[PDB]
Structures are given as structure tokens and as C-alpha cells.
Amino acid sequence: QKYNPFRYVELFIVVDQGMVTKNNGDLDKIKARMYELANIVNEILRYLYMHAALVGLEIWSNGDKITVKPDVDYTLNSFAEWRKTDLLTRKKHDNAQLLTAIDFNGPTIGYAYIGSMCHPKRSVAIVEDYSPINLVVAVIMAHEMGHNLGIHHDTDFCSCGDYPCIMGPTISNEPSKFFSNCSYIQCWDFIMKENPQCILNEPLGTDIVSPPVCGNELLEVGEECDCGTPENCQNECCDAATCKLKSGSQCGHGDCCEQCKFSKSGTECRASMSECDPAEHCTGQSSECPADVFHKNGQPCLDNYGYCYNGNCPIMYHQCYALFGADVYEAEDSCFKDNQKGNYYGYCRKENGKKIPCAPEDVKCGRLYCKDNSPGQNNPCKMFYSNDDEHKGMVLPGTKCADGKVCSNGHCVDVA
Amino acid sequence: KYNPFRYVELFIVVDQGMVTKNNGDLDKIKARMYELANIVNEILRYLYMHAALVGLEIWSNGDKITVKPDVDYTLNSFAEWRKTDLLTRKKHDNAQLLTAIDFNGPTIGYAYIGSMCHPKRSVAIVEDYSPINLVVAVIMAHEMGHNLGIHHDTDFCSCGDYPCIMGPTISNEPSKFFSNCSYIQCWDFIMKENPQCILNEPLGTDIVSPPVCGNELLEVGEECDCGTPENCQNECCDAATCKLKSGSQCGHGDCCEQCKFSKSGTECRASMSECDPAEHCTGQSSECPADVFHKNGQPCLDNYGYCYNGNCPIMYHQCYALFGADVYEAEDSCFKDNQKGNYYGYCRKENGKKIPCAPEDVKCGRLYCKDNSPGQNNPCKMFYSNDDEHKGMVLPGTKCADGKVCSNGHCV
Ligand SMILES: CC(C)C[C@H](NC(=O)c1ccco1)C(=O)N[C@@H](Cc1c[nH]c2ccccc12)C(=O)O
Ligand SMILES: CC(C)C[C@H](NC(=O)c1ccco1)C(=O)N[C@@H](Cc1c[nH]c2ccccc12)C(=O)O
Ligand SMILES: *[C@@H]1O[C@H](CO)[C@@H](O)[C@H](O)[C@H]1NC(C)=O
Ligand SMILES: [Ca+2]
Ligand SMILES: [Ca+2]
Ligand SMILES: [Ca+2]
Ligand SMILES: [Ca+2]
Ligand SMILES: [Ca+2]
Ligand SMILES: [Ca+2]
Ligand SMILES: [Zn+2]
Ligand SMILES: [Zn+2]
Numbered sequence: 001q002k003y004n005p006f007r008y009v010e011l012f013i014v015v016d017q018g019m020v021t022k023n024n025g026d027l028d029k030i031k032a033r034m035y036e037l038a039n040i041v042n043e044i045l046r047y048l049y050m051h052a053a054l055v056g057l058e059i060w061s062n063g064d065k066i067t068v069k070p071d072v073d074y075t076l077n078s079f080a081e082w083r084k085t086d087l088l089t090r091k092k093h094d095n096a097q098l099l100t101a102i103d104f105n106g107p108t109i110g111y112a113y114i115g116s117m118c119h120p121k122r123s124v125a126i127v128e129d130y131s132p133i134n135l136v137v138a139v140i141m142a143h144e145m146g147h148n149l150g151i152h153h154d155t156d157f158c159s160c161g162d163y164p165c166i167m168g169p170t171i172s173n174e175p176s177k178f179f180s181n182c183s184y185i186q187c188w189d190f191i192m193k194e195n196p197q198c199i200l201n202e203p204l205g206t207d208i209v210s211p212p213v214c215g216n217e218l219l220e221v222g223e224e225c226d227c228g229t230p231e232n233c234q235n236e237c238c239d240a241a242t243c244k245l246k247s248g249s250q251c252g253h254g255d256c257c258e259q260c261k262f263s264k265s266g267t268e269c270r271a272s273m274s275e276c277d278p279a280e281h282c283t284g285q286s287s288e289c290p291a292d293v294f295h296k297n298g299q300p301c302l303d304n305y306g307y308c309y310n311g312n313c314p315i316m317y318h319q320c321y322a323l324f325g326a327d328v329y330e331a332e333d334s335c336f337k338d339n340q341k342g343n344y345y346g347y348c349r350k351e352n353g354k355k356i357p358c359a360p361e362d363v364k365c366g367r368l369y370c371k372d373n374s375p376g377q378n379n380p381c382k383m384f385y386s387n388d389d390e391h392k393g394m395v396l397p398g399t400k401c402a403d404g405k406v407c408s409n410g411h412c413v414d415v416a
Numbered sequence: 417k418y419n420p421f422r423y424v425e426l427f428i429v430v431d432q433g434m435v436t437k438n439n440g441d442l443d444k445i446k447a448r449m450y451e452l453a454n455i456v457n458e459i460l461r462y463l464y465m466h467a468a469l470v471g472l473e474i475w476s477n478g479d480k481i482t483v484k485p486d487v488d489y490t491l492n493s494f495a496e497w498r499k500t501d502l503l504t505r506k507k508h509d510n511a512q513l514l515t516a517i518d519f520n521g522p523t524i525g526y527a528y529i530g531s532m533c534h535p536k537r538s539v540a541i542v543e544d545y546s547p548i549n550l551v552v553a554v555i556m557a558h559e560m561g562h563n564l565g566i567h568h569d570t571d572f573c574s575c576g577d578y579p580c581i582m583g584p585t586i587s588n589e590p591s592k593f594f595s596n597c598s599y600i601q602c603w604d605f606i607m608k609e610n611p612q613c614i615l616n617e618p619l620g621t622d623i624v625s626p627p628v629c630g631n632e633l634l635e636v637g638e639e640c641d642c643g644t645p646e647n648c649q650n651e652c653c654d655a656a657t658c659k660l661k662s663g664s665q666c667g668h669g670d671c672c673e674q675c676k677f678s679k680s681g682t683e684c685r686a687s688m689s690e691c692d693p694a695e696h697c698t699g700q701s702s703e704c705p706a707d708v709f710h711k712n713g714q715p716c717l718d719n720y721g722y723c724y725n726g727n728c729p730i731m732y733h734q735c736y737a738l739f740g741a742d743v744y745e746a747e748d749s750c751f752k753d754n755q756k757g758n759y760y761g762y763c764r765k766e767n768g769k770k771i772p773c774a775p776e777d778v779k780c781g782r783l784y785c786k787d788n789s790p791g792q793n794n795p796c797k798m799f800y801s802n803d804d805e806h807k808g809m810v811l812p813g814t815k816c817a818d819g820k821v822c823s824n825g826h827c828v
Contacts, residue, residue, distance in 0.1 A: 113789070153742075384803070
């Protein structure tokens with residue numbers, strides 16, 4: 001299971017009603033451009049060791065499914081909410097942008113949550129159809145996505161050469177394709193230090209909706225392999241320019257592809273996480289590490305210390321350990337009553353602003369309590385809270401709150 | 417010149433139990449304390465650490481705290497003594513109480529985890545478990561390693577076929593070796609939570625125990641010292657005479673280029689700011705000058721700040737440190753939640769207890785910064801973690817007005 005240096009943003013573009021009428025209804029033409037923007041956005045991000053892959057296009061040729069308002073802050077929280085409640089529940093994807101004809105107040109031609117990549121709500125960005133030039137619109141797209149990647153503007157002695165850089169204070173008439181030194185650092189700081197696990201997988205060709213394109217470094221339909229331009233290709237299994245495999249190779253992609261041949265059967269290709277993570281192994285007859293399989297969510301795991309959840313086994317014990325280190329354990333039940341106060345630290349589910357208190361049963365599903373015996377600092381009900389992320393130190397969704405019960409969204413709901 | 421090592425400046429406090437046990441022979445106790453401290457420096461070398469005994473206090477009259485058999489009491493009591501008494505009249509990084517009175521849950525040692533340099537918590541307690549110096553020494557090494565965020569050797573950390581310093585339990589025949597985990601954790605805690613109080617190198621005169629040749633600590637009567645002749649790697653000093661070999665000039669301190677002097681203008685000390693007048697050497701100077709600063713209050717940085725202990729603290733620079741780029745100084749109006757008296761909003765502390773700011777001292781408690789993150793707009797964002805309520809307080813010495821500044825929670 002080799003380590004991929006790249007990440008991948010499985011993008012989802014939405015196009016507003018406004019934008020459509022601009023284009024006289026030509027749905028096919030829109031699609032065509034959204035396919036092209038995508039490839040320029042992936043071109044651009046390559047410097048950052050990142051790819052951009054269009055896994056969904058949804059044109060509101062019917063009508064805007066949210067009110068697209070001139071004030072760009074309302075509109076963004078609005079698109080972020082629809083992204084989460086409607087789009088996400090219908091389609092898997094990492095990041096969604098909204099292209100629009102609507103004139104924003106600023107004037108602002110782009111607006112996007114900082115360091116949000118992968119956040120169920122905030123991994124989003126609004127983008128003005130600020131020009132017919134695709135190089136321009138794509139630069140804006142890549143720019144906002146950069147903000148999501150937690151990149152801030154260039155300042156001071158940031159450089160991308162003697163051209164206009166992507167995260168420059170403001171856009172040029174004749175824009176370049178170049179992120180800046182400052183951008184590359186800030187972006188990889190965000191990955192290293194926030195880890196958006198969701199951009200980790202290479203998207204499958206079937207998964208991608210743009211006409212397959214050879215040399216974009218995205219394996220796609222009809223391609224036997226892809227490894228960029230002839231000048232960049234390190235894959236001696238692949239004819240960079242024709243995207244077909246070379247002579248004897250049975251493969252030129254995947255974790256189950258060695259030298260150029262298929263991986264021996266039994267060859268582990270996806271390491272197990274926990275006991276809710278059955279390992280995967282190569283078929284001996286294919287080129288890709290077989291799909292990932294977990295156990296039955298809710299399965300007695302860890303000598304019945306926990307009930308499974310997405311391949312892992314969340315037990316209060318480990319949760320303490322992470323927060324508070326060696327020799328610290330689960331606290332007295334009494335400690336959890338502080339969850340009903342509904343204050344800065346004690347609660348269950350923040351809904352979209354306020355801190356909702358805990359139900360006297362749901363108290364084992366808010367802020368966590370641990371019995372810290374750190375000499376000279378013994379404290380029965382040790383708790384953890386930073387407003388640097390109020391989630392650090394809340395019980396993980398999936399944790400036993402009793403027997404035959406788990407914490408689902410603030411609640412100690414029932415198991416089955 | 418960057419120094420790998422850190423230097424624990426240890427202070428030992430000996431209790432009454434001990435004293436009676438030695439029938440009051442102080443001249444003796446002193447002698448053993450010196451030995452212990454030396455043994456404890458040997459041990460530590462592996463962590464690239466040193467222990468230097470810069471203080472020793474035998475309670476041969478009164479006992480300065482009622483050391484109870486509840487180690488946790490004795491410990492918090494002895495910590496408060498350290499900081500509200502001992503530390504007032506003696507500079508020192510870490511302190512240890514050797515007792516001869518037995519503690520409860522059969523306890524030979526007791527120390528704060530990762531407490532190194534803490535005004536109150538930089539201490540540990542060790543028990544007169546044994547006449548055997550090396551046995552006692554090791555407890556001291558141990559409860560120090562605790563002080564340093566070092567944990568019990570889990571289940572398979574190793575150090576040869578010897579019992580290791582941070583083993584679950586002590587053996588009948590201890591050894592001077594720290595385990596690999598220990599090296600790791602040590603420096604993680606040092607890297608991560610860097611304690612500044614162990615960076616300076618003890619002056620030879622800062623040390624109270626009889627100078628030693630080949631202990632890796634420059635002292636009085638020594639020209640240089642670089643440990644055993646087996647470990648001494650600078651070809652400038654005979655590591656047994658400690659007075660430099662054939663025609664060597666110097667051998668320690670920054671200003672010594674392999675066995676000889678530096679020269680003039682040669683910058684010698686860091687310069688945190690413009691409030692730190694670099695200081696260079698001169699040749700004829702075997703070492704570096706004393707760290708000159710700037711008469712506190714000397715205007716600095718476009719007239720946004722006034723100096724302090726070497727740096728130049730301004731509100732803005734302090735928002736950027738906590739929150740990153742694009743987060744600037746908040747309007748005075750936010751700072752007003754510092755008279756609220758609540759978990760985040762005070763101006764200082766009297767006794768565990770928080771004092772709300774007077775309207776006057778307001779830009780002198782919790783910090784507030786303007787954060788316009790799209791979708792997450794917050795005009796008066798501040799930092800608060802129960803890991804350290806102090807993280808986010810305005811920095812002791814920061815400009816809060818034309819001419820006025822912050823000190824111990826006031827704009828004055
Ligand atoms: C407050 C407002 C003025 C910020 C801008 N608006 C514009 O820059 C604009 C409108 C018409 C001409 O310029 C904004 O929308 N900022 C956006 C877009 C942006 C900022 N820098 C670059 C560089 C390259 C491409 C796009 C952008 C932003 O994302 O910050
Ligand atoms: C409650 C009690 C059993 C905890 C131990 N006690 C002992 O270690 C002990 C009692 C009689 C003989 O040994 C404790 O507080 N230990 C200390 C000191 C310690 C533990 N392991 C090592 C290894 C090397 C040096 C010192 C120690 C501790 O801090 O854990
Ligand atoms: C960016 O690169 C240029 C190299 O020309 C350098 O001058 C500039 O200061 C660098 N700054 C950062 C933050 O990398
Ligand atoms: Ca993905
Ligand atoms: Ca391709
Ligand atoms: Ca699996
Ligand atoms: Ca010191
Ligand atoms: Ca010496
Ligand atoms: Ca200076
Ligand atoms: Zn921007
Ligand atoms: Zn211990």
C-alpha cells in the first residue's frame with residue numbers, strides 16, 4: 001500500500017440559474033466549460049502536489065435551490081447548508097463550488113471558508129462568473145479552493161516568479177497558473193496539521209464525469225494508464241502520450257501492481273486499522289487493491305468495551321489516553337452531569353450556533369470526563385476544552401454510553 | 417553557537433527525618449548530597465541533559481512544612497514552599513525534597529509530570545530508601561524524568577540486560593541507563609513544551625558542590641571540562657588536567673574557535689528584537705559579554721510598542737501568534753468582556769481566584785483579536801484552553817495606551 005504524495009479533491013461544481021440564462025439554456029455548452037475549468041484547476045494545483053477531479057455537475061436550469069443573495073456572506077452559509085443537507089446526502093465528494101452570475105457585494109468575485117477542506121458543511125466556495133475567459137474563472141476557482149486548503153494571500157516577499165500568483169492580494173487581467181512559495185507551505189501545513197483524510201483516495205475513472213483526458217494524471221475511462229506529459233512521466237509501465245500500457249506490463253497503476261505485473265495473491269494491499277477493519281489483499285488477477293470492507297457497525301469489539309463504527313472501535317479509554325496520556329482512565333458516571341448545565345464546555349450537540357444541553361441520559365455523550373491521577377494534580381472529573389476546536393474532547397460518535405447503546409450525534413441513542 | 421544540551425539547575429532540600437537519622441551530622445549529609453547530584457548527572461547524560469547542584473538546604477532546626485505521609489499533600493505543600501518561599505530568595509530550575517519519613521501508599525518518589533521550570537510545579541520528592549548512593553541517585557533521576565514528561569517503560573522499551581531508570585518498579589541493583597522511549601519522550605516534551613529555564617549554562621560559581629574533573633560541567637579551578645578522556649571530543653583540553661594541552665588558548669563558551677579566541681564585532685548573542693543590542697566579542701574575550709537590553713520603555717516598532725526583558729510585545733503580533741494570518745487587533749470594545757469575571761474574562765489572579773479588570777486595565781487581561789474568516793465572522797475572538805488558562809492573556813509588558821503599558825494586570 002504505497003504512500004501517495006498527492007491528495008485529490010473530488011470536486012462538485014454547481015451552476016446557478018442566473019448563470020444559465022446568461023448561456024441561453026445551452027446545458028451541453030455549460031457542461032462543456034465546467035469540464036474545461038476542472039482541467040485547468042487540476043493543472044494549476046499540480047504545483048501544490050494536489051489534483052482536482054470533477055465528480056459531479058449539477059446545473060440549476062430549473063431554479064436556484066437556495067436564494068443566491070448579493071451579500072456574499074449570507075449566500076455562502078446558505079450554499080454550505082444545502083451542500084450538507086441535500087447534496088452530500090445524495091453524492092459523495094470532497095469539495096463543492098458554486099458558479100454564479102449574481103453580482104456580489106464588495107464587489108466580491110469569490111468567497112470561501114478558510115481551512116475547511118473535507119468539513120461536511122464548510123468544504124465549499126462561491127465563485128463569480130467574472131469573465132468568459134476560462135483561464136480567469138479557473139484561477140478564481142483554484143484560488144477559493146486554496147482558501148479552503150487553508151492558504152492565505154501572498155504578502156511581503158511571497159513569490160511565484162515574475163507573474164501574478166494565485167493567492168495574490170487581487171486578480172490580474174493577464175493571470176498566471178502559478179501558486180506561490182507561501183502557498184505551497186501554508187497548504188501543506190494545513191494537510192500535515194489538520195489532516196483532511198477525505199482527500200486521500202485516488203478517484204476511480206468511473207467516478208469522474210469529465211471527458212476522460214490523457215495526460216492529466218488521472219486514470220480514466222479508455223485509459224490503460226496516465227502519468228502526465230511525456231516530459232513528466234516516471235511510469236515506465238505507461239506510454240505517457242497514448243495512455244496505453246507498454247509491451248509486457250499487465251499493469252501501470254494501483255497498489256497491487258508491482259514492477260509492471262500483478263501482485264501475488266495474499267499480498268496485503270490495505271493495512272488493517274482495528275478489529276473492525278478486515279484487511280484487503282491482492283487478487284493476483286487484477287491491478288487494484290480490492291474495495292475496503294469493515295465489520296458490521298455495532299459489533300461487539302474490544303472484549304465488549306465498544307461497538308464498531310466505520311472500521312474503528314471507539315472506547316472512552318483510548319479517548320482519554322489521547323487527551324491526557326498514559327495512566328488516565330474513564331471517570332465516575334457522576335462527572336457527566338456537568339453536561340446538563342449547557343455552558344462553554346458542558347453540552348451534547350451544538351446545532352448551528354447554540355450549545356444545546358444534555359439529556360440526563362445523554363450526559364455520557366457530550367464533553368468527556370476522565371479520572372486523571374497526575375501526581376500533585378489529581379482531579380476526579382478531568383475535562384478538555386479549547387475554543388480552538390470545541391470538538392476536541394467530546395465523545396466520539398460511535399462510543400458506548402452503556403450496554404447496547406452508542407453515542408449518535410450528541411445522543412446516547414440505542415444500538416441497533 | 418547552538419548548544420545541544422539542557423542544564424537542570426537542581427536544589428535539594430533535606431528534611432528532619434533525614435537529619436535525626438544522621439544524628440545531625442550536616443558536614444556529612446552535604447557530602448552525600450554532592451555525590452548524589454554527581455551520580456544524577458552521569459545518568460542524565462544519555463538524555464543529553466545535565467544536573468547541576470546550585471543549592472542545598474538542610475532543615476536541621478525546624479521543619480519548614482508539616483510533611484504528612486500523604487505524598488500528595490507533602491507534594492503540594494512542598495511545591496508551594498518552593499515557589500512562595502524558596503524561589504523568592506534563590507534562582508533555580510527544579511527542587512527535590514529528600515525525606516526520611518515514610519509515605520502512605522508505599523511511595524519512594526513522587527513528581528509532577530512535565531513540570532520542568534514551572535514556578536510551583538518544578539519539584540519532586542525522593543525517599544531515603546537506601547544508604548546506597550546509586551539507589552537514591554536513581555530515584556532522583558527517575559522523579560526528575562517524571563518532572564520531564566517521561567513515562568514508565570511501557571512493555572518493551574529497552575536498555576540492554578540492565579534494569580532501566582523509568583521501569584515500572586525499581587530493582588535491588590539499579591543501573592544508570594535511560595531507555596529509548598525515555599530519550600524520545602524527554603525531548604518531545606522539550607521540543608513540544610520547551611522549558612526555557614534549562615537553557616542557560618550554569619556558571620562555575622553558580623554551583624555549590626566541590627568541583628569535579630570530567631563531569632561535563634565547567635567549574636572553579638577548571639580551565640575546561642569535557643567529560644571523561646574517552647568522551648572528550650574537542651582537541652583543545654586535556655580531559656584530566658582540565659587546563660588545556662600544549663599551547664591551547666581557551667576551550668569553552670561561544671567565543672572560542674577550536675582552541676583559540678574570537679574577534680571584534682563578531683556577533684555573539686541572539687537579538688530577539690531591536691530591544692536587544694546584539695553584543696559581539698572583541699578577541700581578548702574568551703567568552704561573550706553579558707546580555708545588554710534596552711532601558712524598558714524605549715519606544716519600538718513604528719511606535720507601536722515599548723521594550724521588556726529584551727522583546728517588544730504588541731497586541732497585533734500577539735493575535736497573529738494565536739490565530740494565524742488575517743487576524744488583527746480588535747477594537748477596544750471587545751476587551752470589555754474582561755470585567756465579566758468569567759472563565760475567559762479576567763485581568764489577573766489573586767489566589768486561584770480571578771479578578772475582573774477595572775475599566776482602566778481592560779486591554780491588559782485576556783487578548784481579543786478581530787477575525788473575519790468568511791462564514792465564521794468573529795470580531796472579538798479570544799483564546800482559551802483549560803490546558804493553560806494563561807494562554808491568551810495579554811503578554812506581561814504590552815503597550816495598551818500612549819505611555820501606559822501592562823504589568824501584573826494593569827495599564828500603568
Ligand atoms: C472585499 C473584496 C474587495 C475582495 C475581493 N473582490 C475583488 O477582488 C474584485 C471584484 C472585482 C474585481 O476585483 C474578492 O472577491 N476576493 C476573492 C477573490 C480573489 C482575491 N484574490 C484573488 C487572486 C486571484 C483570483 C481571485 C482572487 C478572494 O478569494 O479573496
Ligand atoms: C503506590 C506505590 C506502590 C507506587 C510506587 N512504589 C514503589 O515503587 C515502591 C515501594 C517500595 C519499593 O518500591 C512508586 O511511587 N514508585 C515511584 C518510584 C519508581 C517507580 N519505578 C521506578 C523505577 C526506577 C526508579 C524509581 C521508580 C514512581 O514514580 O513510580
Ligand atoms: C519566497 O521565495 C523568494 C525566492 O526568490 C524569497 O526571496 C522569498 O523571501 C521566499 N519567502 C518565503 C516565505 O518562502
Ligand atoms: Ca476523496
Ligand atoms: Ca487521464
Ligand atoms: Ca478494510
Ligand atoms: Ca537554569
Ligand atoms: Ca567539572
Ligand atoms: Ca544584546
Ligand atoms: Zn482570497
Ligand atoms: Zn515513576
